[PDB]
């Protein structure tokens, strides 16, 4: 019995005792998301506790068929998934303390309360309140007040407890046999064993830093244009020679620049395809919206949705009789059960979100034949890329003209197509440098390259070099600004979004080239193209059974990641930006403080 | 015709597990496959060795009845030349089979919201299954090289596992009631057939 015929079996019993327990937890979670009651919480707790106990028992029993003697890259990925001492390598008096740290951070972040330097009654929390005050306000002092108040009350009470998280998590990383906790998170991008497709853990460090170079010229021009358009909004507040205050970006932490469209609209006085009026005019409902989408995915050759989706999936808000969490989510309960939970309204945004979640179910359905442990995306940046390429395909005016949402003339003049490019760029181009900055900071605030006393002196120096923002008022060392973000306060990897963004455009260009599309890439609809659907499916099917390198190559033909596809998507906007930036200044000086 | 219980087999309150596999000798009246084509649409009607209508007009020496319920995606494994969990470790069909396979969904009858764990199938076997042969036994199966003494644990496993049917399962996992019929010839004179 080679340890390859004592691990072939073990996994056969795991695949059957895991499906039932995962299905029962998924059903309990779905029931709680249907009714928010007291019994449903108890059912969720029981199911989750049983599932976690089974996982822990199987993980403990696993480690027993050593790694070095298996030879079947597949029976070995499953062992990698099961053999893994996360937070069980620590002493019993340390794991509880770490869990207390995470629980305290989550509680502090969720129960935020700024209050006013005046009437001690109003105590605006995060959502809503602060998110609203940063979204639809044009004052300067008020936004500065909110920005400083959130990071003053919340920031101080989160570092003494972050400084102790950066010790225990690192020590655990040294125990499970890893270099560092950042190296722990850069682990799903690690592939070993197959010749010609390897990807070292430190290789991503170089790949990201090499891809952000071929972006600087576009982001720099976009930043210059945004600064020029923001001059008139805040006259005596921004200098042309250098950066933009970090509290004037329409988003609380600067993650997205979407709320600046109303201030930086290009050729305005020309609306964007909004078919919401036609929705009310032609009596459209959620069932018809989801029917329309099954029709898009049956055009590209991919399959229909089982009757179980139609019978067991809530699509409209029940009302005041029930309490449900209105949040678009695609559910894969397993054992042939697929559901989508969303409170649908007659809008174009919900029309696109339906396609997004429907693409999520088609991926999930694609790899249903794989073993339990491999039923996931190739990495953390493929599941959200084909949920968003379909939104781009559906948003095209040609697709909307083929289903009866626009009058069949709708002259596709170049005046209004550029307003769509800039708005679409304010959520893609404006978030990649922020993600790279945050991930680089977190990565080196672990390898010990930034000693504690310098945690918040390097941060505001990185945000003046990599991105174009500057703090409004000085922050001493006792603050902790990154912990104000949702992902930093919790334990979530943040580099997945950069990879998602750079993979979605590669997939889009590959599919459009496979569809014999002629013209600009942003005018591409992948409907009525069987070849494109077949090419995507040959990637959607594998899941984790093969390295993500081969999965990417099966569609784009490239061995690794690339930023060229995304700069080809933005060529007209880039040329126009160069055209209107001749009289302006491109670039920034890392020395203009909105506080001397 | 004497009306063999072709309506007591294809009509019962409860069947047996995948690994038991009951067997009545029927062979007592005139074949009445007309009702077989009736009684709800079928997921598969895959007679190998004869043709439907062609039947109700052939003298068979003995027609053995065999009954069990399996999941949807595993219905295709009841066929010659097929390798699978059911084929290798439960009921086997010979490569020279001649008969009919009748399967239809039974979600309303053999499913419960909590779960139906009364139907059992074997997963591991220290050898393969010969044609038309049963094997009932709970003897623990040893994976490693340390004998176990019939106790669960390290590289030690209990064979037969439970299904756990639920009404919300997909088409491939919903219960599918399957009846497979047998057709062999013997030196005895043929009497069990229609005029
Ligand atoms: C996708 O194709 C359908 C079906 O069109 C047929 O198949 C095409 C590949 C091509 O060969 C057509 O000539 C075929 O008729 C389109 O649905 C039709 O669209 C036309 C648009 O002029 C309309 O007149 C028909 O009534 C439609 N037929 C229907 C709805 O049953 C569909 O528009 C195509 N999608 C696009 C172009 O985005
Ligand atoms: C890996 O194991 C599976 C299951 O035993 C087997 O089917 C497969 O052929 C193996 N991979 C190869 C090609 O060695
Ligand atoms: C898919 O769904 C559409 C609309 O529900 C239906 O008309 C069509 O027959 C289905 N096609 C297949 C192959 O299931
Ligand atoms: C759009 O096309 C016109 C016609 O050639 C051209 O003059 C103009 O510069 C282009 N740009 C816009 C959007 O005005
Ligand atoms: C809550 O709502 C679900 C869905 O309609 C229903 O099936 C269930 O019986 C309800 N439970 C309670 C708490 O009444
Ligand atoms: C962690 O679990 C035990 C703890 O002693 C150890 O023997 C085992 O090798 C470790 N698992 C790993 C690092 O794969
Ligand atoms: C037996 O029960 C089945 C299932 O309800 C029914 O369709 C059939 O007519 C019955 N016939 C008998 C009594 O054999
Ligand atoms: Zn999504």
Coordinates of C-alpha atoms in Angstrom, one line a residue, chain A residues 105-391:
Chain A
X105 CA -11.0 44.4 16.2
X106 CA -14.3 43.4 14.5
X107 CA -16.4 44.7 17.3
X108 CA -14.5 48.0 17.4
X109 CA -14.8 48.5 13.7
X110 CA -18.5 47.5 13.5
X111 CA -19.5 49.7 16.4
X112 CA -18.0 53.0 15.2
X113 CA -19.1 56.3 16.6
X114 CA -17.5 59.7 15.9
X115 CA -20.0 62.1 17.5
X116 CA -19.6 65.9 17.1
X117 CA -17.2 68.4 18.7
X118 CA -20.6 69.9 19.8
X119 CA -24.1 68.6 20.6
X120 CA -23.2 65.3 22.4
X121 CA -26.4 63.7 21.0
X122 CA -25.7 63.0 17.3
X123 CA -23.3 60.1 17.0
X124 CA -23.1 59.2 13.3
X125 CA -21.7 55.7 12.7
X126 CA -20.1 54.4 9.5
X127 CA -22.9 52.9 7.4
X128 CA -24.9 55.2 6.9
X129 CA -23.6 58.6 8.0
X130 CA -19.9 58.8 7.4
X131 CA -20.1 56.9 4.1
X132 CA -22.9 59.3 3.1
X133 CA -21.0 62.4 4.2
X134 CA -18.0 61.3 2.1
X135 CA -20.2 60.5 -1.0
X136 CA -22.4 63.5 -1.6
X137 CA -20.7 66.5 0.0
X138 CA -18.8 69.4 -1.5
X139 CA -17.7 71.2 1.6
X140 CA -14.0 71.0 2.7
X141 CA -13.9 71.6 6.5
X142 CA -16.8 69.1 7.0
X143 CA -15.1 66.3 5.0
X144 CA -11.8 67.0 6.8
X145 CA -13.7 66.8 10.1
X146 CA -15.2 63.4 9.2
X147 CA -11.9 62.0 7.9
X148 CA -10.0 63.0 10.9
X149 CA -12.7 62.0 13.4
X150 CA -13.1 58.5 12.1
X151 CA -9.3 57.8 12.3
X152 CA -9.0 59.6 15.7
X153 CA -11.5 57.7 17.8
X154 CA -11.3 54.4 15.9
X155 CA -7.6 54.6 15.0
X156 CA -6.2 55.0 18.5
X157 CA -8.2 52.1 19.9
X158 CA -7.0 49.7 17.2
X159 CA -3.2 49.9 17.2
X160 CA -2.3 48.7 20.7
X161 CA -4.2 45.6 19.5
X162 CA -2.7 45.5 16.0
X163 CA 0.8 45.6 17.4
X164 CA 0.0 42.3 19.2
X165 CA -1.6 40.8 16.1
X166 CA 1.6 41.5 14.1
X167 CA 3.5 39.3 16.7
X168 CA 1.3 36.3 17.1
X169 CA 0.4 35.9 13.4
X170 CA 4.1 36.2 12.5
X171 CA 5.1 33.6 15.1
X172 CA 2.4 31.2 13.8
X173 CA 3.8 31.8 10.3
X174 CA 7.3 30.7 11.5
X175 CA 5.7 27.6 13.1
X176 CA 3.7 26.1 10.1
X177 CA 7.1 26.2 8.3
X178 CA 6.8 29.5 6.5
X179 CA 9.1 32.5 6.1
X180 CA 6.6 35.1 7.1
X181 CA 2.9 35.8 7.3
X182 CA 3.0 37.8 4.1
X183 CA 4.7 34.8 2.6
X184 CA 1.8 32.8 4.1
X185 CA -0.8 34.9 2.1
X186 CA 1.3 34.7 -1.1
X187 CA 0.7 31.0 -1.0
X188 CA -2.2 30.4 -3.4
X189 CA 0.0 31.8 -6.2
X190 CA 2.6 29.1 -5.6
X191 CA 2.8 26.1 -7.9
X192 CA 5.5 23.4 -7.7
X193 CA 6.1 20.1 -9.5
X194 CA 5.0 20.6 -13.1
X195 CA 7.8 21.5 -15.5
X196 CA 7.6 24.8 -17.3
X197 CA 4.7 26.2 -15.2
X198 CA 6.3 27.0 -11.9
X199 CA 5.7 30.2 -10.1
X200 CA 7.7 31.0 -7.0
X201 CA 6.2 32.7 -4.0
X202 CA 8.6 35.7 -4.4
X203 CA 8.0 35.8 -8.1
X204 CA 4.7 37.7 -7.6
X205 CA 6.6 40.4 -5.8
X206 CA 8.6 41.1 -9.0
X207 CA 5.6 40.5 -11.3
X208 CA 3.4 43.1 -9.6
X209 CA 6.1 45.7 -9.5
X210 CA 6.9 45.0 -13.1
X211 CA 3.3 45.4 -14.3
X212 CA 2.6 48.7 -12.4
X213 CA 5.3 50.3 -14.4
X214 CA 3.5 49.9 -17.7
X215 CA 0.5 51.7 -16.0
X216 CA 2.1 54.9 -14.5
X217 CA 1.7 56.8 -17.9
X218 CA -2.1 56.3 -17.9
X219 CA -2.7 56.8 -14.2
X220 CA -0.5 59.9 -14.2
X221 CA -2.5 61.5 -17.0
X222 CA -5.8 60.5 -15.3
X223 CA -4.5 62.1 -12.0
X224 CA -3.5 65.2 -13.8
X225 CA -7.0 65.5 -15.5
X226 CA -8.8 64.8 -12.2
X227 CA -6.6 67.5 -10.4
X228 CA -7.3 70.0 -13.2
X229 CA -11.1 69.3 -13.0
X230 CA -10.9 69.6 -9.2
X231 CA -9.2 73.0 -9.2
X232 CA -12.5 74.8 -9.9
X233 CA -14.4 72.7 -7.2
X234 CA -12.0 73.7 -4.5
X235 CA -10.1 76.8 -5.7
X236 CA -7.6 77.6 -2.9
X237 CA -7.1 74.1 -1.8
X238 CA -5.1 72.2 -4.5
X239 CA -1.8 73.2 -6.1
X240 CA -1.1 72.1 -9.7
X241 CA 2.5 71.2 -9.0
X242 CA 1.6 68.3 -6.7
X243 CA -0.8 65.8 -4.9
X244 CA -4.5 65.9 -4.0
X245 CA -5.7 65.8 -0.4
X246 CA -6.8 62.3 0.6
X247 CA -10.2 63.6 1.9
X248 CA -11.5 64.9 -1.4
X249 CA -11.9 61.7 -3.5
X250 CA -15.6 60.8 -3.0
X251 CA -14.6 57.6 -1.1
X252 CA -13.7 57.4 2.6
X253 CA -10.3 55.7 2.1
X254 CA -9.7 56.5 -1.6
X255 CA -10.3 53.0 -2.8
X256 CA -12.6 54.1 -5.6
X257 CA -13.0 57.4 -7.5
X258 CA -16.5 56.7 -8.7
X259 CA -18.2 59.6 -6.8
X260 CA -16.0 62.1 -8.8
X261 CA -17.9 61.6 -12.0
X262 CA -20.4 64.4 -11.3
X263 CA -17.4 66.7 -10.8
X264 CA -15.1 65.5 -13.7
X265 CA -17.7 64.7 -16.4
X266 CA -16.1 65.1 -19.8
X267 CA -18.4 66.1 -22.7
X268 CA -21.4 66.5 -20.4
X269 CA -24.9 67.5 -21.5
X270 CA -25.0 64.0 -23.2
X271 CA -26.6 61.3 -21.0
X272 CA -25.4 57.7 -20.7
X273 CA -27.5 54.6 -21.8
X274 CA -30.0 54.4 -19.0
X275 CA -32.8 52.0 -19.8
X276 CA -34.5 52.3 -16.4
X277 CA -37.4 54.3 -17.9
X278 CA -37.9 51.6 -20.5
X279 CA -38.1 49.1 -17.7
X280 CA -41.2 50.8 -16.2
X281 CA -42.5 51.5 -19.7
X282 CA -42.5 47.9 -21.0
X283 CA -43.5 46.1 -17.8
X284 CA -40.2 44.4 -17.0
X285 CA -39.9 42.2 -13.9
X286 CA -37.2 40.2 -12.1
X287 CA -38.2 36.9 -13.7
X288 CA -38.0 38.4 -17.2
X289 CA -34.6 39.8 -16.3
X290 CA -33.2 36.5 -15.2
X291 CA -34.8 34.9 -18.3
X292 CA -33.1 37.4 -20.5
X293 CA -29.7 36.4 -18.9
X294 CA -30.2 32.6 -19.3
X295 CA -30.6 33.6 -23.0
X296 CA -27.2 35.4 -23.1
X297 CA -25.4 32.3 -21.7
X298 CA -27.3 29.9 -24.0
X299 CA -26.2 32.0 -26.9
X300 CA -22.4 31.5 -26.2
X301 CA -23.0 27.7 -26.0
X302 CA -23.0 27.3 -22.1
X303 CA -25.9 25.4 -20.4
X304 CA -29.5 26.2 -19.0
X305 CA -30.4 26.6 -15.2
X306 CA -32.1 23.6 -13.4
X307 CA -35.7 23.9 -12.3
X308 CA -34.3 23.9 -8.7
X309 CA -32.9 27.4 -9.3
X310 CA -36.3 28.5 -10.5
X311 CA -38.2 26.8 -7.6
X312 CA -35.9 27.4 -4.6
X313 CA -34.2 30.8 -5.2
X314 CA -35.6 34.1 -3.9
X315 CA -35.5 36.9 -6.4
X316 CA -37.7 39.7 -4.9
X317 CA -37.9 41.2 -1.4
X318 CA -40.7 39.4 0.4
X319 CA -41.6 42.6 2.3
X320 CA -42.3 43.3 6.0
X321 CA -43.6 39.8 6.7
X322 CA -40.0 38.4 6.6
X323 CA -36.5 39.7 7.3
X324 CA -33.9 38.9 4.7
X325 CA -30.4 40.3 4.1
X326 CA -30.7 42.1 0.8
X327 CA -27.2 41.4 -0.7
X328 CA -26.6 39.9 -4.1
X329 CA -25.0 36.5 -3.5
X330 CA -24.5 33.4 -5.7
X331 CA -25.0 30.2 -3.6
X332 CA -23.5 26.9 -4.4
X333 CA -24.9 24.6 -1.7
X334 CA -23.5 21.5 -3.5
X335 CA -25.1 18.3 -4.6
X336 CA -26.6 19.9 -7.6
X337 CA -28.2 22.9 -5.8
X338 CA -27.6 26.4 -7.1
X339 CA -29.3 29.5 -5.9
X340 CA -29.0 33.3 -6.1
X341 CA -30.2 35.6 -3.3
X342 CA -30.8 39.2 -4.2
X343 CA -33.6 41.8 -3.7
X344 CA -34.1 42.7 -7.3
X345 CA -35.5 46.1 -8.4
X346 CA -36.2 47.3 -12.0
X347 CA -32.9 49.1 -12.7
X348 CA -30.0 48.7 -15.1
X349 CA -27.7 48.2 -12.1
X350 CA -29.7 45.2 -11.0
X351 CA -29.8 44.0 -14.6
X352 CA -26.0 43.9 -14.6
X353 CA -25.7 42.4 -11.1
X354 CA -28.0 39.6 -12.3
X355 CA -25.6 38.8 -15.1
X356 CA -22.7 38.9 -12.6
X357 CA -24.3 36.4 -10.2
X358 CA -25.5 34.3 -13.1
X359 CA -21.9 34.1 -14.3
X360 CA -20.9 33.0 -10.8
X361 CA -23.4 30.1 -11.0
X362 CA -22.1 29.0 -14.5
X363 CA -18.5 28.9 -13.2
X364 CA -19.7 27.0 -10.2
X365 CA -21.7 24.6 -12.4
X366 CA -18.7 24.2 -14.7
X367 CA -16.5 22.3 -12.2
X368 CA -19.2 20.2 -10.5
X369 CA -17.4 17.0 -11.5
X370 CA -14.2 17.8 -9.6
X371 CA -13.4 16.4 -6.1
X372 CA -14.7 18.4 -3.1
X373 CA -11.4 20.1 -2.2
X374 CA -10.7 21.2 -5.8
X375 CA -14.1 22.8 -6.4
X376 CA -12.9 26.4 -6.5
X377 CA -11.3 29.0 -8.7
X378 CA -7.8 28.4 -10.1
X379 CA -6.7 31.2 -7.7
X380 CA -8.3 34.1 -5.8
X381 CA -8.6 36.2 -8.9
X382 CA -10.5 34.1 -11.4
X383 CA -13.9 33.7 -9.8
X384 CA -14.6 37.5 -9.8
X385 CA -13.2 38.0 -13.3
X386 CA -15.8 36.0 -15.1
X387 CA -18.5 37.6 -13.2
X388 CA -17.5 41.0 -14.6
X389 CA -16.5 40.2 -18.2
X390 CA -20.2 39.4 -18.7
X391 CA -21.3 42.7 -17.3

